Every structure is written in C-alpha cells, then in structure tokens.
Amino acid sequence: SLAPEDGSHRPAAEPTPPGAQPTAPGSLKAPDTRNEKLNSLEDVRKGSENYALTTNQGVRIADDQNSLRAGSRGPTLLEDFILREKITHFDHERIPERIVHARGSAAHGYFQPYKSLSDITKADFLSDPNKITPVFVRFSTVQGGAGSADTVRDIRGFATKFYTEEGIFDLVGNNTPIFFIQDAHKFPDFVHAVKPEPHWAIPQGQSAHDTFWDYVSLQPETLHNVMWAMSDRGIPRSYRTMEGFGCHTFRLINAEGKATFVRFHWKPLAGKASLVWDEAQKLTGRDPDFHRRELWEAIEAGDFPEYELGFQLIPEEDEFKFDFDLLDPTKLIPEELVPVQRVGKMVLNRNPDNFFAENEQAAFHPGHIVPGLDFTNDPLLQGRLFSYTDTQISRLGGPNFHEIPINRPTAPYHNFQRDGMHRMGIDTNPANYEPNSINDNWPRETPPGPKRGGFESYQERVEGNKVRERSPSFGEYYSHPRLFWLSQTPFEQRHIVDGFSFELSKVVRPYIRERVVDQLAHIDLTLAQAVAKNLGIELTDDQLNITPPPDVNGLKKDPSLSLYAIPDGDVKGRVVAILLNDEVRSADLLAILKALKAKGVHAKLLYSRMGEVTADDGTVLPIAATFAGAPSLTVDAVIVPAGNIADIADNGDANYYLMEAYKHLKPIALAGDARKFKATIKIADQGEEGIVEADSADGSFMDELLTLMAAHRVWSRIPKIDKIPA
Amino acid sequence: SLAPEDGSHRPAAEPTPPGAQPTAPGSLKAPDTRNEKLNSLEDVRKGSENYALTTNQGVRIADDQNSLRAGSRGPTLLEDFILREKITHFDHERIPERIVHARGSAAHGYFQPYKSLSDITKADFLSDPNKITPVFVRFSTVQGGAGSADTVRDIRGFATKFYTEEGIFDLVGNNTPIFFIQDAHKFPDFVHAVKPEPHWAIPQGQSAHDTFWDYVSLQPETLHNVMWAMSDRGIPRSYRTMEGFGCHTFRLINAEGKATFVRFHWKPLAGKASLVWDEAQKLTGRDPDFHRRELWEAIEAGDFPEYELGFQLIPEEDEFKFDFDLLDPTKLIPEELVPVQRVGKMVLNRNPDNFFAENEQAAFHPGHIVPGLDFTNDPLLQGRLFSYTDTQISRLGGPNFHEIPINRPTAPYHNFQRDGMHRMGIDTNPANYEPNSINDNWPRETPPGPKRGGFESYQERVEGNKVRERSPSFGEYYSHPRLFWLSQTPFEQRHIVDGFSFELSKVVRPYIRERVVDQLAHIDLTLAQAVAKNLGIELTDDQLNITPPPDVNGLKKDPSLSLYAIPDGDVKGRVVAILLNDEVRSADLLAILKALKAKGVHAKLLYSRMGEVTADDGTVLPIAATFAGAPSLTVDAVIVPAGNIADIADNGDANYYLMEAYKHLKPIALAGDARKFKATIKIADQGEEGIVEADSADGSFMDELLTLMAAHRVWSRIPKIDKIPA
Amino acid sequence: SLAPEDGSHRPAAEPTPPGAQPTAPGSLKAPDTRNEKLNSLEDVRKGSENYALTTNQGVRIADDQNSLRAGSRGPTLLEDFILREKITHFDHERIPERIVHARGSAAHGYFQPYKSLSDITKADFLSDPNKITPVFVRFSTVQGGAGSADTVRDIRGFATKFYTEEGIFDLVGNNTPIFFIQDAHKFPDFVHAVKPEPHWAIPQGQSAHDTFWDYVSLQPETLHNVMWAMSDRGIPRSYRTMEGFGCHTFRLINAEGKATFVRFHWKPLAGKASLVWDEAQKLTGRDPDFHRRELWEAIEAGDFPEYE
Amino acid sequence: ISRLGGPNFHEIPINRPTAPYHNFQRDGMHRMGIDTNPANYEPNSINDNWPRETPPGPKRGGFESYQERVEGNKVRERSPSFG
C-alpha cells in the first residue's frame, strides 16, 4: 500500500507552475524559505516519515484496521481504548467558525519599509528599511460559511498580522475603503440582514435577497459600500489583484508626541483585476475553491503576492477641512485630495503546513496595535475594539488563544496573567500580582519613550455629554456613492447597473425594489433610470426632479476609484488555456510556450480526454485536464494552435470553451486552421480587436496576445456579446 | 526596588527544613534536580526577572495601575485594550474541577525497577534496572471540591503517570485495596450518595450524612470499603504514610504471550500512620491545607516521599482457586495467600512550578497502558475505561488534552488525528489517513513483539449471552469486612466503632442508622453491639443470632491489613513542637535539637508572641509561631525544656497545647521544672508510659522520646483520655 | 418498597425548628410559598414519585444495577448506550466555579417598598408600596473555592437579583461599605495576591499569607477594607446578622431627569452579630457548611432572613 | 459534548422527548430541568426509590437487550466472511 517506485507521489521541493506537481504543505514544498516566525513554529511542527503510528499517549498501534471484538463477527468491546481515542479525537475536530469572514485563505510572508518613518511614527516596524517583519495574511469573503465558495459577489477581508519586535500589530482591513454602517452598535443588524435569513438559512454567500435590500432601503448610510459591492470590485479575479484598505482613520504618534491622522492602503503589485458576474457566478459551481487554489499555486510557482503599503496622512489641524467627517467610515478620502504615500512592501512567499492549525485558528484583531500607533473616535472602530477579543473566547476556546502557535508573538511577553483553559505557559514567577516585593516587582512597567517604551494613549481632548447620538456631520449619504459612480468607466457603470438589476430581481417583495430605486435616484438619475428599466419600474416626476448631491470638495470624479481607468496590468502569474488536437503543430506550440514563459504566464494543455497526445514531431504532450474539467472560467485567455483541427472542430465542448471565453471578454488567439473557429463566435474575415489570428503562432502573434492580456479583458467587445448564446 | 536590601525576600535554593524559608516553585527551589520529563517542559517554562510587563501580544505596558478614562475622574473608555485583555484573562481563569478527586496535591519524581521483569512482562519501563522512568504523582481525597480540606475522613487517591519510552502508563490507584461498588454502571449512584446532597449542597468532604448511609444500607457490597473508610485508614497522617493499591486485577503479558494476573501495590517507605478522628477534624479547621503543605515541605527539605512498587501475581490457571472472584473489586487478595513481590522504587523529588498548569491540568486515566500490560473483565475497571477519556472533553476543553505540557508523552507520538480545539501540533504529513500512498503510508503500524512492538490485546476467551447481570460469584458481602475487622488491633477496632458511631449520629433519619446496624450484625456481633450502644439501639434476638460469615480461604485474620499490628515506624521528617519560655535552659535545648537533627526530625519553636526570646546563657532563639498559631494538631510530639516555667505555667494556650497533644496520644517530654505541667494533664508522680520526664534533657531523655515517636502514638493512653476536658 | 412503613423518611411540609426534620428541596418543604418568579419556574421543575426511571431520551430502563456484558463475568459491550449515557452525564457534571465568590448560599424571597419613591427615581419596582418584587439572593465568601469553608475570615458578598416588571436589576453588594482597591485595572493583582499562591495553591479561604500582606504593604489604598476584614466584621455569626452595602455611588433618576447620587445599604432586622476568631476557625473544621446550613434551616423554621 | 456544549443536549427543545423522562442524572452545563427529587441516586429509601426501574414486558416495559450468544477470543480481526 505504498508509494510508486518512480517517486511520482512526492512534489518537487522547487518552484513549479500551477498543475505541474501535486500541491504540498509549505515546509515540504519550500523548506529553504524562512523567516523568524516560520522558524519559531518549529517547536510544534510534527513530521511523519519513518515514525511508528501511535495513540496520542505514545503507544504503538499494531492493527489500525479493526475494532477489538469478542470473536471476529462479535460485538465491539468497551476496553478498545485505541478505537475510542481515535474516534473521540475525530468527534471533536470542529470549532466554531468566525461569525463573519468564515471563508478565508492565508499565507506567510515578510514586510519591510522603504525608508524610516520616524518623523511621523515611532512604530519599530517602520523605523528601518532593513528591518524585516514576518507577516501572516488571511484574505476572506464576509457573509458565507467556511465551506462557501470563493468567487461570490461580496466584500473581501484582507487581514495582516505583523510580528514586530515591539509586539503583534494586526491591520485588519477590507478590499473597499469604507463600510456599510456608521456605528458598531448596528453591526449585528447589518450582518443579520446580509446573512442567510433566519427561518430557512438561505441564501449562502449572497446579498441578493429581501432582508439585505430591506436594510439598505431603510439605512441610506449603506449606499456607498453597496455601490462598491455592486461594481466589479465585488468579484475580484484573485486576492493578488484587489486593493486593501484599513477602513478607519487611525493615528500615527512620533517620538515628539505629535499625532497624525492616517488611513492605510495596500496596492496590489500585480494590478487591479476583477471577473464579470456571469463568470464569477458560474465559477462558484465549477470551482468553489478558485481563489484559495490560485493563491496557493501562485506561491508554489514563485509568483509571490506582493503589496505596497501606503498611507493617506492628515495633520491634526486639518481634521475639519473636508466636507465629510474624517471619523465617518462610510466616507472615503479621495486620493485627489490626499495622496497615498508609499511606505513599504509585503511579499507572501510561503503557504502554511496545516490549514486548520495555522489558518482556521489564526486570530486577528484591530485593537492589536503597538507604540507609535493609536485609535480615533471613529464609532465603528470603537466598537470593533470590544468584539475581536470577546469572540475568541468561544471560537478558540478561551483566553489563552495567544498561545496557539500561529498567534504567538515573536517579541517577548511576560505578565501576571495565569491559568485559563489549555494553559501552555508554565510561569515560574513567585509572584502573580504587582506591585510585589517577592520578585522585586518583575516583570516591570516601562515608561513610554522613543523606542522600546510602554504604550501610552495619545492625550486626545474629550468634551461632550454622555449621549447615544449620531454626529450631525455623519448625516450625508449620497455624495460619495455619486463620486464613485462618476469615477467609473462606461463599462464599469454598466456592470454596476447590472449588479443592482440582478440582485433586486431576486428580491421577492416588490416595494423593496422600488424603495432601493428611489435611493438610487438620490445618487444619480442615469443610474436610477437604468436599474428601474431593468426592473420594469418607471421613475415618478418627483424622482426625476431630485437634485443630485454636491461634489466632494469640488471633485467631479477621481480616477483612482476605478479598477480600470488607469492601466496597471501585470501578466506575470496569469494563465492561458491551450486547446490541443491529436496532431499539434509543434512549431506553433514551441513559439507559444516560449513567449508565455518570457512574461511569466502559465499554460494548461487541454484535450477531449486525459492521458497524452503526440505532436507532429513526436513530442508527447501530457494533458492537464479536459475541456469540461478546466473551463475557460479558470483562465485569462485561450490559444488554439494549428494541426489536425478536424479532430476538435465539431467537439461541442471545444466550441463552447471559446464561446464562454468570448462572452467573458477574454483574449482568444487562433493559429493556422484553428481560424475555422471564428465561425463559432461570429468574427468577420477582417478580424476583430480582441481576436488574435495569423497563419502561425509567431513573435508578432504572441506579442499581440500578450498585449491584450496586459489590458485584462476586451471591453470593446461588450456590444457584441448580447447575441451569443452562451 | 521593592525587594528588601538584605535579599530576605528570596528563598535559599537548597534543601531547608519546614518553616525555615518561604516555599518556592520547584525549578527555583531545586534548579539542579532533573529528569527527562522535567527537561522536556523547559520549552514552556516562562521566567520573569529583568523582563518588561507586556500584553499577551508582547506590547509593553507603561501604566499597570490605571484604566484609560476621559479625564482623571471620568468614564473608562472602550478603547482600553490593555484593561480588557487583563480582565478578560482573569474572567476566564477557572476550568471545571474533576468530578471526583477534585482536591489533590502533586509532585514530580522518578521510578526505577530493582531488576528486569522480562520473564513476566514485556513492559519496557520494567525491563532494565538502569532504566529510569520520570513520574508525576497526584494524591487526592475523593468527595470534596478542589477548595475542600485535606484531613477529612475519606478514601484517598494515589495516581502515578509514568512517562515510559513506549508510551504513558497511568496507575490510577487509591489507598485501600478495594472499592465500594462492583459494576461501573452504579458509579454515579454511589458518588451522588456520598457527595453533598442536591437540594442544599451539604456536607463538604464528609460521608456523615443521610444519603451516603442510605445507599450503604441498601447495597451491602459497599460494606468492605466502608470498613476501611471508618478505620483510621480514612484519616492518614501524610500522603507519605499511606499504602496505595491499583484496585483491580490487571494482566502482565510477557514476550511469549503468557498472561499473569496482577494486583498493584505501593508500600510507603516512611511507614504507615494515621491521625485520630478528633485531631483530623479539628485540623481541617486549623489548616485545611495540611497534607498539601506537608508534601511540598517534605520535598523542599529532602524528605523525599518514597514508595516501593509491588505485585501480587496469580497464574492464569489459578483464576478460580479462591473463595472470592479475582474480578470482584469489592474483594481483596490477602497477602497471607498471595505475597507482594517487590518490583521497584519511586522517589518524589521536585515540586511543580505552577499548581494550575501542572497539577490542576494533569489528566490520569487507567486505560493508559503500554505493551506488556492488559485489562481483565473486572466490571468496575471495564466502565472506568470509558470515563477517564470522556470527562477530559469538558474538564480540559477538548481532545487535544495530551498536548497540555504536563500530559505530553516523552515517547514519540505520530498518527493521523487532526484539528480539535487548542490544536498545538502542526502536522506536515501530506496524508491524514491510512492506508495512503502519498506519504508511503507513514506513520506505519508496528507488529507486536518482545520490545518496541505494537499493542495487541491478550486473546482472552469470551463466552456467554449479552446480559445485564451480576456474576453470582460476586454475591457475598460480609466475609471480607469480617476479615478486615478481625485483623485490626483492639485500639484500631475501637476507632472503627467510633467512626461508624460518629457518622451514624449525623444521619437524621433513625431507621437508616438501624438498617446499618443490621448490616454490621452480619459482619461481627461485637462490632454491631458496640455501635448500637453508642446509638441507643438494642439488637433483636434475631440479630444476636446471625451466623458470622465464613473465613476467607481458611484465614481468621491477616496482619498486613492493620496499620499498626506490625511496627514499621520511621521518624525521619516528623516534627516536634518545642514550647519556649522567656529564659530557656540552653543546655536542654542544645541536647534536644542535637538528637532531633541526628534522626532527621524537625522542630518548631513556639511562644506566646512572635520575635525572639533569650536563653539563660544569652543565646537568641527565633520564634516560629505562637501556641495558637501552630497547634499541637500539626506536630508529632511536644517537648517542653526547663527554665523560667512561671512565664508560661498560667498561659491557657500553653496548657491547652499539652492537653490537646495528650488527648491525641502524642508523645510528650518534660525536663526539669517543665515537670510542673504534669498537673495539667493529670500525670501521677511516678510518671506514666508515653510521658518522658527527667531533671535535664539528656542522658537517655531524647532516646526515650524518639523511641516513642518511632511507635507513632501512645495507644496505651486511650483509657485515660476520656477524663480530660480537651 | 424501600421507604419505612411509618413514613418517617419524608419531612413534614410545615415550618419546623432546626434538626426536628430532615431538610428538603424548597418546593417540597413549603409548597404554598409562592411569588411570580417561583411560579414561573414551574415549567422546568421536575418531580419523581410514581414515574419510571428512563434514559434522557425517554426510554424506560429495566436494570439500573448492571452494564451489558458478554456473559455475567465477561467484558462490557460498547453497545451499552444506557451505561454510556449515564456515565457521560456524570463525567460532565461540573462547570467552572466563579472566579471570586465561588463559595455561596442562596434563597428565594420578595421585596416591597415602604412608600412610593417616584419623587427621586422612576424605577418601577420602587414606585408603589403595593409593588411586590420577587428576589433571589446569594451570600458568599470571596477568596475560597465552592468547596471551601463558610466561617473563614473574609469579606462576604450579598447579591440580590430583583425580578422587576421593567427588567432584572442586580444589586451586587458586600458586607462592608468599601473595597480594597480604587481602579478595576488592579482587580486581578489584588485577587491574585489574596488567593492561594500560585506555586503550591495554599492557603484556602485565608488572607493570612505573604502575598496578600505584600500587596497590602505596597498599596496603602487597601488599608481601609483591610481594617474591616481584620475586625469581627470578617467573621459573621450568620448571613442574617451582617450588613450589606452597594459599595459604589450610583445615581437615581426621576421622571424629570433629575439625578441624585445614591449609596445602597441593607440593614439586617435580626441585628449585627459576629463570631470570635478562635470559634470561627475551629468552626471551619467542625462544620465548614455552618452558614449555608444556618440559612437553609432558618428559612425552614420560619425565621426568614429580613433586611431593610 | 463539543457540538452542543455538554450532556444536557436532550433539553435543547427540538431534541426533547415527548415521552416522560425521569432519572438520577444531575447538573452539567446549561442545565434546564430543576429536579425536586430528594434523592439523586438509587437504590434510595428517602424517595421510596422513585423513579423506579420497569421490567421488560409486551408494552410500556423497560429495555432489555436480546440475549445473543457471544463466543470467541478478544481479537482485532476482520471476519473472513467480509473479504
């Protein structure tokens, strides 16, 4: 019952392109990739090769195939302690999933700053460009359970645990720069409204249902993040190709005591890229693990996810200078008003070893700050500070969750806390209280100061009465949705319209749809009309007369809010499907793979069955998957080389493959006789922008294809796709 | 600095007698003591000197005296994460206590066999006299909570975790050879009956209440262990001075596959010794921690608890050779029939560092056996096998309780179990199932064999129908209680009578006392009538004529059942109270302490206040405690040296000290004018056995006293004590 | 039938002095003592007389004396679900005890105001002398575990849950008018200092040890409550004979929104009385359940604890 | 015990029998039923031994296992009949 003689069960411990080898635990795939945190886990990493199988008490097992019974057809005996331990451990494997962001995918990596930031913050991890800080990052959706699908329409979470020399800092952000609501007290109302409805627990992974649109219609403060969610920002192509934001105004505190307001950003160095809805939705069924898989395989390939940390910085004296409140988390700060300053780079370069132990049990919380950082009175942030420590008590089984290996600081920690369930640390301190004389008061308080100091809160002035009241400055709900809307390209706007139209069409109570359209009329009449038309709703005269909200501090638009308006394509790490026939022209394939390899673009070789095919020159080509097994949803572009095209010309799956890729705006390249497929997608002889064609696959042919892929999708094709039945 | 300039806050890191230094964590008290298990806990030991006080996330705290508030008289702010982390950990410090044996005290040590036992067992830890096995031993009561008193009347637990090279072996025993009930299905009934009654949760740490004696009167199988409990066995002097027993027949299995029946024994090398009831009960008030204290201080002094492991061995073909069933856990195996064969020595030589982490969290379970041992069909043991795994899932929070440091095997452990709450080990195996080819099937099963082989159960024959039935062979309840009774000395018998008499006086419903007397009449008429008289009950003529039960395989007594029939006194580690006066005779004191030192007996110098007094010759004598502070209950003998006896002669506390000690049968020694105290305890001028007296404290004065301490108590004094008002 | 012919196993359901009858669950001792909260608990009370013994799933048990085994001297079978359910429930009976005040004794009663307080508070339970509010009160020590002794020297807790028509109000007090410490941030320090020390877990129910006095000597804010604990306040004769205090300044608020500062008091109508130290300490050995017993029996006897 | 937080999962309303249930089991996390029985053990005299075991019978009887014959050695072995 053993490994094959040829050793093909075991993946090479070298970088390999997606699909070339089975995937593996990080420490086995990439044993030479290290950082301080990864090394500190060595105490708890457990191997397996050459070891005897045992109980958890260290007793060797002789027969792991059978229960102990009285005769070989008899009843199982209660003295079988081996059976009961095994079954007991299995019976208790599951722990509660996260209340939100239950679905998530994580990796290890490192961060370093570009230059010292000591003029604006005394945070040790930002103090030296050569101080390297280990990170563990988890990306997530929001609404769905841990076994829901990745490519849903939803906000995405982007949480970073920085293991700094002065403690853990968790930057717990999302992929849009705002949230749906203003005050933490409403968080359970909002989350309950977006989650599956309580009678029947439907729908999973979807805001497209009555309760969510009911809440939105009744709480116009939600409209800004709903605009983001209905745009293609809601359906990213990859965790590598979305932005991150810290959601609130926080403070930086420098050694002199100066406070600067800051908002945090992550810029994807692979560029901004999203799916289209039909693709995204169909992909939740063809591969509900697509983003998890893609993240893992990118890292195994050496296409390490890289992100640039950036800060929007506002001096304390400028708090009131905008037409929105800095502490309102439904408001963004336009980069045209306050530019993002580049701060440093984060590289994710190793996968975990065990998903449960490292991902599922990781606890991130935005209250985990360090000296040099501080909070503000953002009333959403304020409430978050209570929740992320509280929730761990049931999720991770008690207050010793910092001792779970993934959560442990690499910085020293010593204090007078004791006991709690599954206490690991054995304290030797004679004292468990301070002040004490019996241990000469160790461990001791440390004064604040420029570096290695104790934490002190910035002495912000507070003046006001004890009130449950929303600040009047928070009472404006339409100008930021409108700024976002006007900043999108015409195709992005169309996709926003289609997102609202699709979602409200699944709301069963029609008055809810009407009320949401009325809200849309307060943002932009063009948007409101286009949604209304799809829902068979007619705007009233009064609605047609609603005055649009004011510009945001004079802005008519801010192109940094669009995914696509300013080119930022990076093809490295993208993937092409290559549709084989049973006699591929090897000259075409040679040139195709050469050009792809030169830009770091991967290929998957697809056929109508598995196994191998032989090219015209005898080259044997292993088949990664069938046309149906790896649909065009999973790739960025499709190439069909020349050869025995008759072999696949009438294959329904091969034809469909191209109709689907065409519909979803992906570049297609057809060489030699593969040009016969132009008929399936109705391309005129003259050709079409977005379809690359020539007698063979050459320099020019690949250059054109790769240029298209740098632009992500072929937006000009959109008018031509209504008609395709796919 | 808060520590005193003279360093008097820090206990000397060397062996010191009780009271000489404050007690300390083990690793600080005795840093040079080691064994394989203590070494392996180093990775979780946390120090404190010279470290900064931090959060659990490693963030330094500047002010650990105040919450964060808006103004120094203002409200506490939700953003104070340092306060909430500290208070959250505190709020969740407690875990469920053990269902039974909640009260207990534990120490590290080591075990070594005297010779290889490979002819009778393949257990690795018994294979080589050079093989040294680390242990962790917890002693306990049974009924009371973790916060109940030590010197209650109750059974005691004696549990030993052996960290062997072939797995953990837990020997989970008690301090009597049998149990109260026959089948594990009744364990919740009997435990509910002894435990505090469910309406009002009274009484703590006591079987002296109606529900206990109701159950016993209705379940005569209980009477054997009840006899043990009512004897002075139920109130041991120390955990160092009681026997241990494994309770059941288990099996040894040798390399040839031969099974031998075995019962386990621990023999205390300090000898057998118990309190008397009045002393034990008062001591639960004066020092409810006395046995926990005595154990910790013995180890700190170098009076390491030592026990000899012993086996009663019965060949398989001898299963039915006795008057009782070997599988009946209410039956003992008399040493007169089957001798205890000596096996090895165990020494407890290090205290824990943190009581919660090491003691409270330790999990012992008798199903934890190793190759070379196996179970039998004892139907109480059979049900134990289920409980001790199950109970851990609530008590220790889940199925990874073997990853809590004290519970970890030192032997290797590898298998395919994954996840659960508090998962520490990060498994790198590509497989989490077997058989697998993707990891060449590792970790792998191991065939049984003479050494380092997999566990295989002994192939015992089973034959019968599926029944809920007690074996008829278990239906005899009186012969063992009778054997035990007849094996006791006349003074041990009197204490048994008084134990029943006192307990049944606290049963409110008179018919329950009557029913128990009826049971005693089935065991022994003398015993029954003597109880009856104390309760004002008269035996009927039918009761007077009940035939006594048969002897046990010809035996009319077995002196190994008596605590005192056969002297096994050892004075090392006992303690003497020395009653000071303001002008002590130094020549007496010098001679007292010299003789006590030579035999390893400790002393405490007591007076009417703290501080010092000065001897006749200027020597400054430090006072340990006041007469009231350290009552006679806590020592084994009392010595009063000569001098200014007038100083203390009319001190009520000093006179009462001698009265209490006299009542409790302790040796008393009076030198010179301290002979004046003879009037307070009514001693005749010619003296009496058990009272040492002379003009001065030597020649043979200390030898006489030490001879009396070797015999533990002055049993001959019993008739004199009823006259003394104490 | 196992009960005695003469029926002497069953306590009379009438008030009786201490020791005259066996004590009993309160709904069997005093079936006709009612209040709104006692009545509302009827849905969960379970009786026993005349019912068949069953599993928790409602299956009647024939033999509650034995496990199922292959032969009457054979091995116990894994299919014995009756045995396992019974042992499973047993194996999981315990829950964590309270971090502090683990030792405590409780009773049901009622509260009624002497006059309307609407001039100073809109609290509904204080709005009319006719407003009867059920209460459940728990008295406690502070330091010891749930199985520690009653007559230790310690602060006592006095916690009252008022089941009002406008919500639960809990008045969570102690038997002295102040506390040891000023700021909550130090509570784990002070509690760790008074609790059994961490290396060896000694001593139980006692402040008489190095770490408590170490903290006190370093934190003079403690000295006021320390004086109270060292006085005979720290060893009450009975929960019926001690005072209660709300510890903090709270506020009353009236219908006009006017705030008045308030501190709360409970005045024992049985008067104030404490033990002496020697007696209290010895009592922890002779009857560690003394105060729990004395409260239960006072109620059984009609000596109802009353406090103003 | 982990999924539903302890041994009182039968008191979670959907899981409750509609048949009567009474026994001597007590406590556990989330305990809802308040037992008034003076006894929490059997055999007991203080509550005249209630609730009481019930003999097997044709209807409303106690559970008794079928007395199937068992015969063999204690083995971890698959029956050859299963291969």
Ligand code: HDE
């Ligand atoms: C700006 C990014 C953001 C915002 C605005 C919020 N979440 Fe998150 N969340 C928890 C509670 C919580 C509250 C009370 C609020 C506003 C009042 C937010 N969220 C908004 C939580 C219950 O504490 C949570 C669930 C499980 C857990 O451990 O914490 C939680 C999760 C969460 C994650 C997942 C972190 C991870 O484990 O990967 C992220 C990225 C967010 N929140 C972002 C976030």
Ligand code: HDE
């Ligand atoms: C023979 C020595 C002995 C015997 C015969 C029994 N106990 Fe013990 N016990 C548990 C259950 C249990 C059952 C089901 C039976 C007979 C059916 C016995 N006991 C008799 C337990 C409830 O599972 C227990 C509670 C905590 C735990 O982990 O297991 C348990 C405790 C216990 C200890 C304490 C070990 C320690 O932590 O110090 C000891 C020495 C015994 N039992 C001995 C024992």
Ligand code: HDD
């Ligand atoms: C900051 C933490 C903290 C602080 C400063 C205090 N308490 Fe407390 N108290 C707790 C935290 C706590 C607790 C940990 O939350 C407990 C134990 C578990 C429980 O349910 O609450 C509790 C229990 C508890 C009880 C027992 C309730 C019961 O019987 O079930 C009483 C009577 C008090 N407290 C009273 C006081 C008094 C009079 C205080 C000072 C005037 C005080 N507490 C300060």
Ligand SMILES: [S]
């Ligand atoms: S946010």
Ligand SMILES: [S]
């Ligand atoms: S036993």
Ligand SMILES: [S]
């Ligand atoms: S207080």
